[PDB]
Amino acid sequence: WXAXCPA
Amino acid sequence: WXAXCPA
Amino acid sequence: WXAXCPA
Amino acid sequence: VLDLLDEECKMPKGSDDTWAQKLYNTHLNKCALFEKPRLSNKAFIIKHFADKVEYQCEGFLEKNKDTVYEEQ
Amino acid sequence: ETTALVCDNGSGLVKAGFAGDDAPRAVFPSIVGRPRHQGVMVGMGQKDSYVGDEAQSKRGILTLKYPIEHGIITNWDDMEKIWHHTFYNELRVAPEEHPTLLTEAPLNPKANREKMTQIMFETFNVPAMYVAIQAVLSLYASGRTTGIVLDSGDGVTHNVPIYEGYALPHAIMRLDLAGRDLTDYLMKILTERGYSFVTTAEREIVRDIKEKLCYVALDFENEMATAASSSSLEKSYELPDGQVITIGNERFRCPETLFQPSFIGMESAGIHETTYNSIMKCDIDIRKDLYANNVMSGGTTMYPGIADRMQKEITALAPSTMKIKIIAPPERKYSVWIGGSILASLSTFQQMWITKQEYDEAGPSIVHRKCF
Amino acid sequence: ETTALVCDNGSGLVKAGFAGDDAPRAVFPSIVGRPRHQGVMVGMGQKDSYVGDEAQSKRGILTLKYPIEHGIITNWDDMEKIWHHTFYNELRVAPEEHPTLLTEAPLNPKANREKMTQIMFETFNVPAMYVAIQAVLSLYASGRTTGIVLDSGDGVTHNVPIYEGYALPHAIMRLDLAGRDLTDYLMKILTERGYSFVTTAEREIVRDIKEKLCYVALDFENEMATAASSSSLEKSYELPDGQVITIGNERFRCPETLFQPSFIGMESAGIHETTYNSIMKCDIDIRKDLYANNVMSGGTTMYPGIADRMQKEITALAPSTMKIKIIAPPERKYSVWIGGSILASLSTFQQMWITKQEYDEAGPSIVHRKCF
Amino acid sequence: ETTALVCDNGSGLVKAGFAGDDAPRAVFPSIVGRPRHQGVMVGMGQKDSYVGDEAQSKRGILTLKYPIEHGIITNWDDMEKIWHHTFYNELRVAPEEHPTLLTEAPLNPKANREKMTQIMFETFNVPAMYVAIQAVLSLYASGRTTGIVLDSGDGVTHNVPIYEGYALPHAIMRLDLAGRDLTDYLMKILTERGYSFVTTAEREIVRDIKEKLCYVALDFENEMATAASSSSLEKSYELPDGQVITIGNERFRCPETLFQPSFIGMESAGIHETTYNSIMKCDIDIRKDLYANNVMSGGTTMYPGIADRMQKEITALAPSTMKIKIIAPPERKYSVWIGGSILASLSTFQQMWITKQEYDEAGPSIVHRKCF
């Protein structure tokens, strides 16, 4: 992702 | 209605 | 709640 | 009218009633030669060269449909 | 000959049919729905608006508007959709060809009639039209020329004393509690038990609860004490999703607001004391004939026990030797339509119609001149 | 004399203190955490549950439950832990010795007051108890006997018209949007920019973003076009780990759902039109005094610009010559507690308490009889 | 006329083909490999990167990167290589000449669609493009206009309630467990028996073990006790080198994490309780039609016994008189592509495409305006 999870 | 009641 | 909503 | 019929043959839960609704949406006042009969939602009128002819939507889709399963 | 259409614009239902029919051919809720969600599937066939039973069936997707409230038509484009649906889809009849008998509640705005005529002659091009007071038709429906008609709809309640075929227009009471204010009160009280009904589609579950399970107490305080002391009055119903809900003393409490409008914060007296106050405005020679022949009418009088509570509670007011009788036929829900059907078929009536020639000459104001 | 305790069970915070204090002594989130991971280190000293600021501090390790949602207490064992923590740890007071004024949102289920009383008399053995409507206290807090209080919490929004000290219970609106549904909408929209906040501990980052950076637009469409056309509204915030996140037009978009609940798929109208629809249910003599004295209350009204947007958008509804005034004190977050503190200290009030003698005689049903 | 291309960028596989075909013409893993060893033999013919089945065949020599994870495209140069391979090598078609219907998981970042459009118009110069939500296509694929589609891929899981062709976007759940997190859990648990699978090439042995031998327990604790008490569930598989490995209770333990994400340390609830929690966000009128028509979709639902476990464990949640039905066609792996193939062939759709003229005028932001 960009904040939460890794992608 | 026009004044008293809402219709 | 008990009907109309989750609580 | 033929293209919207072949579409309604493969859209899920298509029916003569939703076909007729699509015809009205697409042509009813956009085209001068297509008319809706005053007292029905299951028919439409085409202004052919000879005369106006009123077609009934009931059972177009059953007649329209061929698919032959290859395995048969 | 061509029959007249007979059409009754309740606040809650449309009843429509042909004169001389014994019951209405089309009854459906006078409701217009619009979609309130994004249209995801391509080629589904969107529709701008549903009407009547179509909007009932879809009502999970829709905001539901009622276009009449308190017997006043509050937006015309919807009401015109409802009439369009009535003539073309439900009756399947060309309005070009039939006189139309419309209907109205007494003492409501004069603008409502004018518009209701203008739309019949301009939009539907009806040959001839009439507008009739609701409470007058319930006497044709019940075989009487004398009585005080209590008529209660979805939107309005009114008393009209009629003696020997003369209305007494100074004695007309109009009271603005009806089935819809019972329904909003029922939602508010149901909230006490935890059930909350919020949306317009969800209101119309409560309307069905009210119809199925409500009844009128014959002593409000005694059944209050009883249901406070026993489960015996408690009864249960299934919501559409399968939740079961259980309803107790509250089920008599909502129709009690008809007899105690203070529950809704309505200052005025209940239907019993406005009925008695209507008879007390009539000339003393006729009270004996209006204490018999109290005619109930319209759906809000369909509650079990309302006739007994009325007779009991007027008999506490009236002098001890007047025979109080309440007359409540089981078809009283349709009685206004049945009486319209009788009225439109009389041959003496055929001079009364407002013909299109006269509307062309006079303009819509004619409806006050050529009508009650 | 012994002071009363005054305790307000918001959905989001507990405020508690002693009557006659000007501000609450204990404020902490009404949240209960339980550990969700294997306990590896022996002898650390495990704990089954944290409450309040303890659960905030540990919250990376914990599942956080709110035991009240929408002003309804949804599991009692947690709420009893929260009260235990309030009396014994935050106030450090024996509940044996002080009356307790509790607080509730109007029109919610009646089983919630019954249990909330039963637990005070059986569990905490309080001498005497009371339960008071939230929106009534904000008038004591704002020096008024007349006004329409708009109060919005973490869980519920309600309007309560009060004129000259009489409530008008038919005109009470309850609306179920509040700070927590704003937070869930904020998480959903933030996902557009790539930030995803998923867990219950991580929700409570978003709540702090909402508090710090959100504001209400004075014209939603103009600022939408602006922030679509300029970086000037774009503002940035640090997550606990030091990641920076940047937030644009979205920061006004979430409190706009208060004025357009359709963003959440809520059918009902916004807080402005429910305020106006509340004034239209009051008698026409008092509307002029309810158009002044719109009192804001509770934390969800703390957004910058909400008072201006309310005044603007009611003034579009009300007749052109009514003086619309919105009253928004800067302490309005605590105003419900301040008004409870005033109410519990009046000498005329000391007859109103439910004493344990009366609860022993009557049982918990007494709470409906001896209270609003 | 020119057919549209229909191409579905799963996280795990590319499915691509022509609209109106009944099944996809090209399916290959969306994987990009690069050589990680010294090139000793001169004149072998080096290659900078392999894609798809080429990278499967060589995978002992290669590092394998997935360029999509959790439905987000995480580096574009690889994804652009994969699309290049799809158009030029697998379909062998000039993308100049065919519209391309792409596909996306709901609620993911908005930048992903902007870039995915920009690359189609600038790089591939496609005439016209569209982007469609995965779970919407599975209803076209399964002949329904109403249902709640549970769709689970290699990278993401989502529920999308659709009633009568309207999506209910507030009720859409996205959950981030999928086939790849099952695979990483499977490697972690396999380490218990001594088998250790470490490298990216060796992960894709574990994926094939998972596909062949895993299944979902219909009562997790009973089969746990069984396989703890008997060899009867123990089954065995050959690694590529001929080592045999033997797998017992563990083979059901990994797909159980879909129903208990706490095994992975995921706080959120399993797919069953997110399905029920999605239906509970819908209007109460439509739940009866969303309790039928639970449509399974995507490869991660291919486990034996998952439909029975879903029906069982939703039936424990839903009210006792709702008919719970789970609909799991055997082609549900391809159902998103099949539904895209249906959608792209409708004549009503041909107005919906984003034509290059419109992208030139508006720029890539148009994808949010002209699309779901």
Ligand SMILES: Nc1ncnc2c1ncn2[C@@H]1O[C@H](COP(=O)(O)OP(=O)(O)O)[C@@H](O)[C@H]1O
């Ligand atoms: N059996 C019943 N018991 C109680 N209320 C009813 C019953 N039938 C209808 N109603 C209520 O009465 C109203 C409809 O009455 P109706 O006479 O059709 O009104 P209108 O004449 O204004 O259309 C609605 O509020 C409906 O809920």
Ligand SMILES: Nc1ncnc2c1ncn2[C@@H]1O[C@H](COP(=O)(O)OP(=O)(O)O)[C@@H](O)[C@H]1O
């Ligand atoms: N300055 C602020 N701006 C916007 N929202 C706030 C602010 N402070 C608190 N809130 C929100 O309001 C809620 C708390 O309000 P509060 O009045 O304490 O609720 P309650 O009275 O039910 O405990 C929470 O949702 C919190 O996020």
Ligand SMILES: Nc1ncnc2c1ncn2[C@@H]1O[C@H](COP(=O)(O)OP(=O)(O)O)[C@@H](O)[C@H]1O
């Ligand atoms: N029969 C099966 N049983 C279990 N898992 C499977 C099966 N078929 C595919 N998978 C797994 O599901 C994922 C592929 O599903 P798919 O629907 O193709 O993903 P996407 O739609 O994102 O490309 C991979 O993790 C694959 O290992």
Ligand SMILES: [Mg+2]
């Ligand atoms: Mg009526």
Ligand SMILES: [Mg+2]
């Ligand atoms: Mg509050």
Ligand SMILES: [Mg+2]
């Ligand atoms: Mg998929």
